[PDB]
């Protein structure tokens, strides 16, 4: 499904208890290409993306950059603090603004309102089961199902309703979109060609219009 957001994580937090964190929320602004955190850091902070776009990347073999995710407003960047950083977070847009707080403040705050952790537990529960079926999926899903799943994921988080459906301004490179799908840009470009000639989508340079999201859902399984 959809990654962690502040709204989903803080939906059951009463307003007065959420107020207490605002003094401890730091605000940072990043320029294009600037790293918000790096792979393997040990700061143990919780970052909230407020404005802009961020990509979780992964420099590994031969120092080849590997796109893992792109994120938008309201989403938690990376993992919840408790374990070094599994990935690097790079600001896509200039004046990318993130709010963050140290883990000590969060755990003290959760200690003050332990009923909040009960409802956040249902969020990590619902997200870990969704994360598990994503792991089984990449074993048993062909590339059109994986393409349909990425386009649906991007549409639900970046989608703009247009006349013929939902436009998806992903603004990735053809290699990048293929990295999210999980195969070569050759295989993915052909799968996009099939989706287009079936009438399901249209390729708008670095945007994609989804004419028939209901068909992509069925193709996902």
Q: Which residues bind Na ion (CB under 5 A)?
A: 146, 149-150
Give the residue, chosen from 7, 63, 136, 197, that forms a contact with a second copy under the rule CB under 8 A: 136
Q: Are 35 and 47 in contact (CB under 8 A)?
A: no
Shortest Cβ distance from residue 147 to Na ion (Å)?
7
- The answer to the question of residue 41 lying near a second copy (CB under 8 A) is no
Candidates 14-22, 54-62, 147-155, 212-220: pick the segment binding a second copy (CB under 8 A). Answer: 54-62
DSSP label at 24?
Answer: G
Partner whose binding site includes residue 150, from a second copy, Na ion, none (CB under 5 to 8 Å by kind): Na ion
Q: 29 or 80: whose CB is closer to a second copy?
A: 80
- The answer to the question of residue 115 lying near a second copy (CB under 8 A) is yes
Q: 80 or 105: whose CB is closer to a second copy?
A: 80
Q: Are 153 and 40 in contact (CB under 8 A)?
A: no
Partner whose binding site includes residue 60, from a second copy, Na ion, none (CB under 5 to 8 Å by kind): a second copy
Task: Kindly determine how many residues on this chain lie close enough to bind a second copy according to the rule CB under 8 A.
Answer: 39
User: Cα dihedral angle (166, 170, 171, 177), rounded to 10 degrees?
Assistant: -130
The number of angstroms, rounded, from the C-alpha of 181 to the middle of its chain's C-alpha atoms is 14
Return d(Cα 30, Cα 37) in angstroms, integer: 11
Query: Token pair of 168, please?
Result: 């998806």
- The answer to the question of residue 59 lying near a second copy (CB under 8 A) is no
Shortest Cβ distance from residue 218 to a second copy (Å)?
12
Give the residue, chosen from 7, 42, 82, 205, that forms a contact with a second copy under the rule CB under 8 A: 82
Return d(Cα 37, Cα 42) in angstroms, integer: 10
- The answer to the question of residue 133 lying near a second copy (CB under 8 A) is yes
- The answer to the question of residue 163 lying near a second copy (CB under 8 A) is no
Return d(Cα 81, Cα 77) in angstroms, integer: 11
Q: 187 or 207: whose CB is closer to a second copy?
A: 187
Kindly report the three-state secondary structure assignment for every residue of 183-212: CCHHHHHHHHHHHHHCCCEEEECCEEEECC
Element spanning 168, H or E:
strand 165-168
Partner whose binding site includes residue 68, from a second copy, Na ion, none (CB under 5 to 8 Å by kind): a second copy
- The answer to the question of residue 79 lying near a second copy (CB under 8 A) is yes
Return d(Cα 111, Cα 221) in angstroms, integer: 42
Shortest Cβ distance from residue 150 to Na ion (Å)?
4
């Amino acid at each position: 499904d959809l990654p962690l957001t502040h709204t989903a994580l803080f939906k059951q937090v009463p307003l007065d208890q959420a107020r207490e964190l605002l003094e401890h929320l730091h605000e940072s602004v990043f320029s294009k290409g600037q790293a918000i955190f790096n792979e393997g850091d040990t700061d143990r902070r919780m970052y909230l993306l407020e404005r802009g776009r961020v990509k979780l990347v992964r420099h590994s073999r031969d120092n080849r950059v590997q796109l893992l995710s792109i994120h938008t407003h309201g989403e938690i960047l990376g993992e919840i603090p408790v374990g070094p950083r599994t990935a690097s977070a790079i600001a896509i847009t200039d004046r990318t603004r993130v709010l963050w707080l140290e883990n000590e403040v969060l755990f003290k705050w959760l200690g003050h309102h332990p009923r909040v952790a009960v409802d956040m537990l249902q969020v990590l529960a619902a997200r870990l089961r969704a994360n598990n079926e994503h792991i089984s999926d990449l074993v048993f899903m062909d590339v059109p199902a994986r393409l349909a799943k990425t386009l649906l994921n991007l549409a639900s988080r970046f989608g703009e309703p247009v006349r013929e459906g939902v436009l998806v301004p992903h603004d990735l490179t053809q290699e990048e979109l293929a990295q999210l799908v999980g195969s070569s840009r050759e295989t993915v470009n052909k799968a996009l060609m099939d989706f287009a000639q079936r009438g399901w989508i249209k390729r708008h340079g670095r945007s994609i219009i989804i004419y028939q999201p209901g068909m992509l859902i069925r193709r996902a399984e």
